[PDB]
Design a protein around this nucleic acid. Structure first.
Lengths: 53, 44, 118, 109, 117
RNA sequence: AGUUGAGAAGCUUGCUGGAGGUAUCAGAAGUGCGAAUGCUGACAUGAGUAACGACAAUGGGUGUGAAAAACACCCACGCCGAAAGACCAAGGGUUCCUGCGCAACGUUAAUCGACGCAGGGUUAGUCGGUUCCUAAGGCGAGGCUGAAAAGCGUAGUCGA
RNA sequence: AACCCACUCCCGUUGAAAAGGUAGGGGAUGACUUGUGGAUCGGAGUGAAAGGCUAAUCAAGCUCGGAGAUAGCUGGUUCUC
RNA sequence: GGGGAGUGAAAUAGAACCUGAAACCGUAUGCGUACAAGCAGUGGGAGCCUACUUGUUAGGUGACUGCGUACCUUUUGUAU
RNA sequence: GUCAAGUGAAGAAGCGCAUACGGUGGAUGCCUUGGCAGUCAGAGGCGAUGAAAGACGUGGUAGCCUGCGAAAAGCUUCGGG
């Protein structure tokens, strides 16, 4: 089951009009002052004003 | 699924070797063709 | 359709789950903090916490009911002597789960699972 | 306006323009936060390229990192590598291992 | 005298691709499709130097019809009355006077009604 | 880009390029490409889709690292066990080991490797071969035969 | 049982596999299976015979030549008025 | 792998290195595109945007609208 | 001011066209240490004094070419430079 015509630029790009990205769930610790994911331990091991690791 | 090349160095050298080619008239002219073409091996 | 159906398959047989979960229980009772995937952390808390609740009471029946489902002598000794006298006045929730980024090779969402008074 | 370029990144261009579309026009610290927490390979690569562009602006000019804005990101295509995957019934197919060229162009406008 | 034909083939393809620019997709950028689109544009343009003279005449006739009916006359009665008289004035400037100079067009339709056709 | 011709086309110029070009009129042609399921290279589309190679099975800890699901070690879990274990012939030909490495190769990553670079490692009177002997079969002084090439063969002498 | 085979289903058909896998199946002290070496070859071999096999090729292998065979057939044949 | 600095007449001659076309893939700017049905053009045509210097111009888009079933080859005949 | 009716400019997930810069890619131009075809000459063979064609060695670094041959990128003599 193949195409009978190659697809154009336009329809190729309209297909991929949906596959753009997001990850905006960042936040800053009040204690240390660094960015980390929401609800996640910091890359320097802090979580809600406390070192955990 | 057994394949068609089953290697043996003795059967190699006795069918296609140097002395087998130089035993017969036609193998001597195999070597002279294959030497006239300029080949590096000439006994395979 | 899994309406109201607990437990998760984790791409495994049931015996594989049982081995992996009592391994993680034993490893958490020795180290008190391990590092694992977030769904295996969500399913460890249903295996590992009844063992501590069982360990809050010293009986021979309790220590070989612990032993047949955490089958290592060292974790039955770590329970009933350390974890179970510590957690004797806490009504559940003996371990917490803290999400910690993603694994580098996959994107497996990672979590730390930690005994609460460590 | 200061560039940094990676000529030949072992990701393909279509996969890298996804992350390239995601930092374009942003502030540099915002862009570094986005790239440092993204789930992808192109963000590791493009974060290293953005670090290089920023440090080029710090050392070859006098711009502060707070002033800088990532102004032009574009991913061109690099030289592919041409390899064989053996398939069934004796048939061989060509794999192209695509590469790409990442250019981050930081500026203070 | 071996003669290498890649320098003239290029200029002939540039000429065809320049004539094809503004077109959709491969109609403007690959030669075997741009060539057909340029030939087809040429046929339509030949045909439409004719249909231009057909289409403007109908628009003039429709505007003269609309202007003459405001003064109580058809198009066809107007064209008949402008030949019971002798006006030798065409559909183009009558449509222009129908839109722009309406009193002059009213004078023309009254001299057609004056010839009672 | 402009411009001039009915056309093939011509002419003038901005940028690029950085060493050749050929008014005119003649001579000569490997003289003009869109098609030949045309040849050869590059690159599309399908599509970031299908797959990633038996459904023995993995989970933590610790280290190293720029970075570890995958390397190493520890703890534990499974799997083979007339083999998924040890070994000899054949075939291969350095793949073996140790340092350093990770571009490419490895259907992912790799700090690991049957991969790259450089070094080292293979010790025999007794184990295998040569050497001694012959089987099938080969070759074969002379010899019989055959347009020639050669065929067959005696003495012989190779051949495990 | 090993080993040798290949009757059935299902899968697979762009395969893990240019003929397999898993379940079952036939022979399994013989007209058996197999290693190593050797012999027979292209109107020519070998064949418990099917046009089977003779290097994934077989109603006449492969390769190189005659050779640019031949084709009343098919396809194509390039700038301008 | 780059950003400078140097060499060089020239490094967008930097070693995959003279020139560096087309296919194909991008980023930026302008304009048009989410009530509209088909070989994607062509005739008409508003609007907008740039250069000019303004106008009865030049370039770019082209809402809307009339007509409009590619090219080849073969055929009595092909959008087929 | 309110309420009706009429009318409709921006606001593009993405696309299209033009333009300008890029990337890929190797055409084109120019170039040649390689070929091709003749003319005029040569000398028409080499080998049991071991050939053509090779294998292995040969160097301070040492792989492969090219020379050499355990005297091994060379040895002895004449001659030229």
């Amino acid at each position: 089951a193949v195409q009978q015509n190659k697809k154009s630029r336009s329809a190729r790009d309209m297909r991929r009009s949906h596959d753009a990205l997001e990850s905006n769930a960042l936040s800053v610790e009040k204690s240390t002052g660094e960015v980390h994911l929401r609800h996640h331990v910091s890359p320097d091991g802090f979580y809600r004003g406390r070192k955990v690791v | 699924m057994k394949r068609t090349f089953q290697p043996s160095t003795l059967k190699r050298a006795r069918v296609h070797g140097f002395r087998a080619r130089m035993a017969t008239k036609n193998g001597r002219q195999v070597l002279s063709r294959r030497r006239a073409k300029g080949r590096k091996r000439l006994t395979v | 359709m899994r309406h109201r159906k607990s437990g998760r398959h984790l791409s495994r047989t049931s015996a594989h789950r049982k081995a992996m979960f009592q391994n993680m229980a034993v490893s958490l009772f020795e180290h008190e903090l391990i590092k694992t995937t977030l769904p295996k952390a969500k399913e460890l808390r249903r295996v590992a916490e009844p063992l501590i609740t069982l360990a809050k009471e010293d009986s021979v029946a309790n220590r070989r009911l612990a032993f047949d489902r955490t089958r290592s002598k060292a974790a039955v000794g770590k329970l009933f002597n350390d974890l179970g006298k510590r957690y004797a006045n806490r009504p559940g929730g003996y371990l917490r789960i803290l999400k910690c980024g993603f694994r580098a090779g996959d994107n497996a969402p990672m979590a730390y699972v930690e005994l609460v008074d460590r | 306006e200061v560039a940094a370029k990676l000529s030949g990144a072992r990701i393909s261009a279509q996969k890298a323009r996804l992350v390239a579309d995601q930092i374009r026009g942003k502030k540099v610290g915002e862009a570094l936060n986005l790239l440092a927490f993204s789930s992808k390979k192109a963000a590791e690569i493009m974060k290293k390229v953005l670090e290089s562009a920023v440090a080029n602006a710090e050392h070859n000019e006098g711009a502060d990192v707070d002033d800088l804005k990532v102004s032009t990101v574009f991913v061109n295509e690099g030289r592919s590598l041409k390899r064989i995957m053996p398939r069934a019934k004796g048939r061989a197919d060509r794999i192209v291992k695509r590469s790409c060229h990442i250019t981050v162009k930081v500026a203070d406008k | 005298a071996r003669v290498k034909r890649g320098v003239i083939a290029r200029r002939r393809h540039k000429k065809i691709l320049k004539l094809a620019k503004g077109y959709y997709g491969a109609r403007s950028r690959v030669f075997r499709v741009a060539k057909q689109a340029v030939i087809k544009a040429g046929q339509y343009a030949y045909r439409d130097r004719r249909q231009r003279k057909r289409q403007f005449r109908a628009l003039w006739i429709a505007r003269i019809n609309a202007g003459a009916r405001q003064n109580g006359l058809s198009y066809s009665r107007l064209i008949a009355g402008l030949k019971k008289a002798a006006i030798e004035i065409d559909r183009k400037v009558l449509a222009d006077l129908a839109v722009n100079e309406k009193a002059a067009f009213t004078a023309i339709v009254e001299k057609a009604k004056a010839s009672l056709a």
